[PDB]
């Protein structure tokens, strides 16, 4: 009885995770489609390797592959970071994913550079991603240099640093990319960039109960060690066909760790199992899971597909005992498990 609980349990709470989380993670998406508009416009998208203005090989949005006078090396470092054979070409969605992660080094760069972190930190959506562009341009050290306008940033002197900036090499050597950053700080708004694009961008419980929570628990706390971290969540994710990035299981486990540790302890996963959710009936649920168990979406959990839900959970069972659970739940005795059955076995 507790075998099949469990199971539903764990896979509900591994869908409560990624539910809690889905508005902050659409937040970010478009966050970082914008920036990503933003730097295509003032550097470009190519799929072929290119020389930059230093004469350095590059692809994607400004991805600087080498600064060897070797093609041959450059072809090295692209097909390294893509993970495939690209004879110096790569698609679209993998430009993309290069930016996404250049985005996330110049961010670590900024928060690493005490020049530049409580800038950054002070300044909103909009104005971070002008921050990161002039990063992208010439390097943390380049806008550190900028004392002055930085200051003006801080403080919130818009029009000032503004006039400021504008009186730069940088502005000289490249102003109409740096006029379209100044107005992105001076007013913080996509307005420098919305037109061109054709302005398509930018927009209480009883004793067997917790009994069978904990166990439900211990199938993320794989260690025992009280604790379900990033990577034990990831781990439980991936088994169950989800490919969650690090900063989306990040971002899970930090909308359930209540006392703010790092890590989501037993209490902490209870209050997640209790939270009422968003527009989600319960049968919702009970479907939901469902579903996962009924891999192929016939209707029916057959005892391979069952086999399948406790090994990919790490709910250790002999084939016996898997055959034990589906007898178990079987009330018209075809073998298999529908969903009134499903629905029998885990209210009671
Ligand atoms: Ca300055
Ligand atoms: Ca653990
Ligand atoms: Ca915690
Ligand atoms: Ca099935
Ligand atoms: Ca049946
Ligand atoms: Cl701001
Ligand atoms: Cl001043």
């Known amino acids: 009885m507790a075998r099949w609980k469990k199971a539903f349990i764990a896979v509900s709470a591994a869908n409560r995770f990624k539910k809690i989380s889905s508005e902050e993670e659409k937040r970010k998406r478009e966050e970082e489609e914008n920036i990503f508009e933003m730097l295509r416009i003032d550097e470009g998208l190519r799929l072929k390797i290119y020389k930059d203005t230093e004469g350095y090989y590059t692809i994607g949005i400004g991805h600087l592959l080498t ?53 950054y930190d002070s300044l909103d959506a909009v104005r971070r991603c002008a921050l990161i562009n002039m990063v992208f341009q010439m390097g943390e050290t380049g806008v550190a240099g900028f004392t002055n306008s930085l200051r003006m940033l801080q403080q919130k002197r818009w029009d000032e640093a503004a006039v400021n900036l504008a009186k730069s090499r940088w502005y000289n050597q490249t102003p109409n990319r740096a006029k379209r950053v100044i ?16 302005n398509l961008y930018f927009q209480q419980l009883t004793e067997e109960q917790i009994a069978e929570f904990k166990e439900a628990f211990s199938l993320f706390d794989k260690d025992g060690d009280g604790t379900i971290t990033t990577k034990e969540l990831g781990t439980v994710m991936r088994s169950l066909g989800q490919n969650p990035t690090e900063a989306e299981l990040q971002d899970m486990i930090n909308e359930v760790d209540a006392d703010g540790n790092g890590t989501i302890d037993f209490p902490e996963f209870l209050t997640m199992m209790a939270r009422k959710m968003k527009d989600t009936d319960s049968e919702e649920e009970i479907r939901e899971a469902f579903r996962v168990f009924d891999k192929d979406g016939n209707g029916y959990i057959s005892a391979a597909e069952l086999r399948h839900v406790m090994t990919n959970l790490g709910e250790k069972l002999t084939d016996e005992e898997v055959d034990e659970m589906i007898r178990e739940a079987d009330i018209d005795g075809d073998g298999q498990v529908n969903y009134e059955e499903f629905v029998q076995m885990m209210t009671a």
């Open 67 to 119: 600064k060897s006078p070797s093609l041959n090396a450059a072809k090295s470092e692209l097909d390294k970071a893509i993970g495939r054979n690209c004879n110096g070409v790569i698609t679209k969605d993998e430009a993309e994913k290069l930016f996404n992660q250049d985005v996330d080094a110049a961010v670590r760069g900024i928060l690493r550079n005490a020049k530049l972190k409580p800038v």
């Open 183 to 198: 107005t992105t700080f001076r007013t913080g708004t996509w307005d420098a960039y919305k037109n061109l694009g054709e």
